[PDB]
From a paper:
Given its crucial role in the viral replicative cycle, the spike protein represents an important therapeutic target and is a critical antigen in host immune responses. All emerging variants contain defining mutations within their spike proteins, with multiple mutations clustering within the receptor-binding domain (RBD) impacting both ACE2 binding and antibody neutralization escape, while mutations within the highly antigenic loops in the N-terminal domain (NTD) across these variants reduce antibody neutralization.
To identify structural mutational impacts on ACE2 binding we next determined the cryo-EM structures of variant spike-ACE2 complexes. The resulting maps were obtained at average resolutions of ~2.6–3 Å. All mutant spikes exhibited slightly higher affinities for immobilized dimeric Fc-ACE2 when compared to wild-type. We did not observe major differences in spike protein expression across the variants, and all mutant spikes tested demonstrated marginally enhanced ACE-2 binding potencies relative to wild-type. These complementary assays demonstrate that the totality of mutations within each variant S protein enable slightly enhanced ACE2 binding, suggesting a contributing factor for the increased infectivity observed for these SARS-CoV-2 variants. Superposition of local RBD-ACE2 complex models revealed no significant structural changes. These structural findings confirm that mutations outside of the RBD do not modulate the positioning of ACE2-contacting residues at the receptor interface via allosteric mechanisms. Our structures of VoC S proteins in complex with ACE2 demonstrate minimal structural changes in the RBD, reflecting its functional constraints in cell attachment, only permitting mutations that preserve the ACE2 binding interface.
Author numbering:
A (entry chain A): 14 to 69, 77 to 145, 153 to 176, 185 to 241, 257 to 298
B (entry chain A): 745 to 827, 856 to 892
C (entry chain A): 943 to 1041
D (entry chain C): 299 to 330, 529 to 620, 641 to 675, 691 to 694
E (entry chain B): 745 to 793
F (entry chain B): 992 to 1041
The structure:
């Protein structure tokens, strides 16, 4: 089942500043009171991060490229954002990745889904509406896990696909800022490593009323960071090696 | 700990002996340098208990009895202000003995002037 | 920055040791920098070549470290000879030499 | 010492002749079979595919739940998390040290003493110095002039060999 | 300007950093030598007319 | 082939840096001597013979 949404309001997507967000732990190695220089796929400091809104009538689900990796930020309250779609052609021709977080658990499936143009979930005022795909024929990987999840909640995720490994990094932050990204530093802990081994070039974010939510999409570039590890092994500050001559 | 690596390393000859000999020469040279700088007197001179030097105060350079290290306040400040097959050999002269040598030199130059450097 | 000369010598020695330890992580053109990985992954005819590449790289690093250690030893020896001269002429006597 | 110096007569002094390595005794292979963990001994450890040789002791470092191994400034593995039981272990490298021979002239005597540099005396007339463990020299409370330099204010002389 | 050569050169580690640091130390040492020899007075004296 | 060129050029550069450091030590010793002569011969009268 698929449903066209024909009540949208035309508006260009916004842009804002990344500040010093998007830093994740590059590996599983504990380091304490040290300064470590690493070259990896990172989000540049103070970059132009794309801003999308969900407000009522805005429902921003466009088609975005994936490129080398995607930093996904969410200023969320009342749990509207539920999951992501990854793939190349987003149909039964190629193999696609499904990540959903419904009312009970988090489900990851790698199947050849015949996706809808507007895949979505629904809450009736309980969850009794699910229209994401019409078929699933060849499934290779399944993974059922625990639930991962004024704007009150900040969700940071980093999605990377290197050597057939899908790295998902996550961080949950209590915030009380009304409209934009708070200015600060928070290192993203690694959440899961999935051996999906599939090509990903495009991704999707998952009458009617749209709850108040906002999300941000940034793109990773190969660069060097200098990370500071404190006495407790937590990354507390970072330096972008190619941002400005002072940080260089 | 690789035996095969050591067997292949033996084909190159006495490079390791040369490097160890050079490092040993540097290590003994550091001790020789410390002997040359600080061990120039064979008598350990001491200041009199009464510090009556005609108004001259040497408390900041003489050793402090209250400190366990027997260092001067200036020397204590100096020590506070300086912060896979590798080994660090300890110096032959420890810091308290070097401080004792400096104390002997200070006592000699205060109580005897330049006479102790040229004889009795 | 009053005591910069001693801190400079300590920093240079520590930096040389850190660089020498860090040079073990380099493969020097071999498939890996770990000897156990080479010995467990390859047959001895090609593992001998990989170990030889690691040996020549590490030996070059060690010879380089010894070379700058000898140069710094010469510099410190000259400074120590100067310090001994100052101890003999300024502390143990009165010097007429200007400055 | 005669072998190292390439001479049959050895002048009085201290000569670094060899090296000592505490050889590994057991192999501990812990993945998430699991060979019974042995602590405070120089063993060959294989933890979740990370292999090495070391002494595994208790650690006061509180790891974050996602971190498994630990590295210092010089990128060497010095801390690790046991996969079976979530505890932190410090990996101290197995003892290695220079072996130096302290002897007078062969014209005088053939008695020698052995200095293990930077090695505690429990891991090898046994005396513990800051330079290392000295075997074969009788420690005395008297102070004399330095005849053979040992280090850290310790000197050796012949009168037997005293330190 | 060869990218492949630089990629192979990165396998040898921090040799280039060592050489650049040594040359930088020599370069600052020359200026220190000139300061030690010539800059021993802080007053610029002039002869009478 | 690039590896052979890299090791040859790196050996040449290390050799050049080594003699540069040795010459730097010699020039530093000469400069220290020159500073001593500037302090003792120009800024004062020296009793040291020759
Ligand atoms: C919702 O709208 C999309 C976009 O118009 C529909 O996708 C089209 O499906 C027809 C099927 O005949 C194709 O010919 C078009 O090329 C598709 N358009 C695009 C942009 O892919 C989709 O079918 C609609 N959903 C429903 C349930 O009708
Ligand atoms: C020599 O100088 C020292 C320090 O300059 C004097 O010690 C001071 O004594 C006064 C009065 O007793 C104290 O209030 C100061 O705190 C002391 N200073 C320090 C650093 O301890 C000392 O009295 C002077 N005279 C003699 C004869 O030693
Ligand atoms: C971000 O991009 C938009 C267009 O894509 C541009 O108008 C805006 O000025 C950019 N902002 C910054 C800070 O570069
Ligand atoms: C959530 O999804 C899983 C997998 O599709 C399903 O088994 C479960 O019943 C779902 N939960 C709800 C409340 O629908
Ligand atoms: C994928 O599914 C189609 C039809 O559902 C089938 O013909 C094809 O063999 C499947 N391929 C694999 C690799 O399972
Ligand atoms: C992945 O897909 C893109 C476009 O669909 C294509 O250009 C690229 O070559 C693909 N890569 C692989 C490894 O299949
Ligand atoms: C590190 O943890 C200790 C408690 O183990 C705490 O007292 C200290 O403040 C922490 N430091 C930082 C920088 O978080």
């Amino acid at each position: 089942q698929c449903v066209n949404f024909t009540t949208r309001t035309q508006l260009p997507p916004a842009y804002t500043n990344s500040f010093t967000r998007g830093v994740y732990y590059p590996d599983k190695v504990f380091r304490s009171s040290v300064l470590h220089s690493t070259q990896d796929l990172f989000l540049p400091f103070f970059s132009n991060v794309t801003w999308f809104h969900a407000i009522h009538k805005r429902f921003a689900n466009p088609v975005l490229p994936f490129n080398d990796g995607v930093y996904f930020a969410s200023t969320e309250k009342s749990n509207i954002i539920r999951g992501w779609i990854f793939g190349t052609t987003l149909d039964s021709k190629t193999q696609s990745l499904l990540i959903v977080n419904n009312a009970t658990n988090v489900v990851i499936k790698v199947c050849e889904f015949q996706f809808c143009n507007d895949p979505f979930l629904g809450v009736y005022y309980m969850e009794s509406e699910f229209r994401v795909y019409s078929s699933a024929n060849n499934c290779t990987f399944e993974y059922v896990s625990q639930p991962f999840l004024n704007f009150k909640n900040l969700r940071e995720f980093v999605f990377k696909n290197i050597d057939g490994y899908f790295k998902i990094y996550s961080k949950h932050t209590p915030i009380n800022l009304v409209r934009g990204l708070p200015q600060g530093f928070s290192a993203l802990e690694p959440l899961v490593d999935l051996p999906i081994g599939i090509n990903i070039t495009r991704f999707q974010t998952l009458g009617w009323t749209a709850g108040a939510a906002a999300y941000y999409v940034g793109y990773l570039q190969p660069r060097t960071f200098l990370l500071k590890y404190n006495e407790n092994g937590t990354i507390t500050d970072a330096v972008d090696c190619a941002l400005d001559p002072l940080s260089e | 700990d690789s035996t095969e690596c050591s067997n292949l390393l033996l084909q190159y000859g006495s490079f390791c002996t040369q490097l160890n000999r050079a490092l040993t020469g540097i290590a003994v040279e550091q001790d020789k340098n410390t002997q040359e700088v600080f061990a120039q007197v064979k008598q350990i001179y001491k200041t009199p208990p009464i510090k009556d030097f005609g108004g001259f105060n040497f408390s900041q350079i003489l050793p402090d009895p209250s400190k366990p290290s027997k260092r001067s306040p200036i020397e204590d400040l100096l020590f506070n202000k300086v912060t896979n097959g590798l080994t660090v050999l300890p110096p032959l002269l420890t810091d308290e003995m070097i401080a004792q040598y400096t104390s002997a030199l200070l006592a000699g130059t205060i109580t005897s002037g330049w006479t102790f450097g040229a004889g009795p | 920055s009053a005591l910069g000369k001693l801190q400079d010598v300590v920093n240079q020695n520590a930096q040389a040791l850190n660089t020498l330890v860090k040079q073990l992580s380099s493969n020097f053109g071999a498939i890996s920098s770990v000897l156990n990985d080479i010995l467990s992954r390859l047959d001895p005819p090609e593992a001998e070549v990989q170990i030889d590449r690691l040996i020549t790289g590490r030996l070059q690093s060690l010879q380089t470290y010894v070379t700058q250690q000898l140069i710094r030893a010469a510099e410190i020896r000259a400074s120590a000879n100067l310090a001994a001269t100052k101890m003999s002429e300024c502390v143990l006597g009165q010097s007429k030499r200007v400055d | 010492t005669k072998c190292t110096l390439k001479s049959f007569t050895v002048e009085k002094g201290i000569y670094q002749t060899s090296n000592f390595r505490v050889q590994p005794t057991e192999s501990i292979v812990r993945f998430p079979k699991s060979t019974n963990l042995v602590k405070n001994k120089c063993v060959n450890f294989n933890f979740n595919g990370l292999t090495g040789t070391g002494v595994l002791t208790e650690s006061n470092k509180k790891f974050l739940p996602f971190q498994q191994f630990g590295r210092d400034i010089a990128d060497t593995t010095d801390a690790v998390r046991d996969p079976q039981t979530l505890e932190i272990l410090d990996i101290t490298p197995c003892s290695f040290g220079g072996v130096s021979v302290i002897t007078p002239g062969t014209n005088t005597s053939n008695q020698v003493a052995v200095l293990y540099q930077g090695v505690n005396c429990t891991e090898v007339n046994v005396f513990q110095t800051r330079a290392g463990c000295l075997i074969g020299a009788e420690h005395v409370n008297n102070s004399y002039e330095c005849d053979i330099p040992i280090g850290a204010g310790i000197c050796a002389s012949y009168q037997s060999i005293i330190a």
